[PDB]
């Protein structure tokens, strides 16, 4: 399944990412819901944009792992899965452009 352009890895882990408050506090009370990573074919574009790339990547994760972004409530979810699955789809960089 996770052959997609967008699983997510999902090792049960809460990771170093400063989200601020609430966000970070949600995290902490069930953390075992969310990705350590995604393997978006690791990024192969040698003109991407941050706002092209990482959003790529979540066009497919949403449809990646439907099941997630389907909660019944879980408000602060998307701040926090948002968030989380935008840096782990940025991070350092992807190759043209880099630090």
Known sequence: AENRPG????????LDIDFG???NRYYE?????????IHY????????????FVTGCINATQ???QGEFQKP?????????????????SLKHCEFWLE
């Open 21 to 23: 408050a609430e966000g």
């Open 7 to 14: 699983a997510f890895i999902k090792q049960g882990r809460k």
């Open 63 to 65: 449809a990646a792992n």
């Open 73 to 89: 409530d879980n408000k602060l979810h998307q701040q926090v899965l948002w968030r989380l699955v935008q840096e782990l789809c």
């Open 29 to 37: 009370a069930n953390y075992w819901q969310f990705p350590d990573g």
């Open 41 to 52: 074919n690791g990024c192969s574009e040698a003109n991407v944009t941050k706002e092209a």
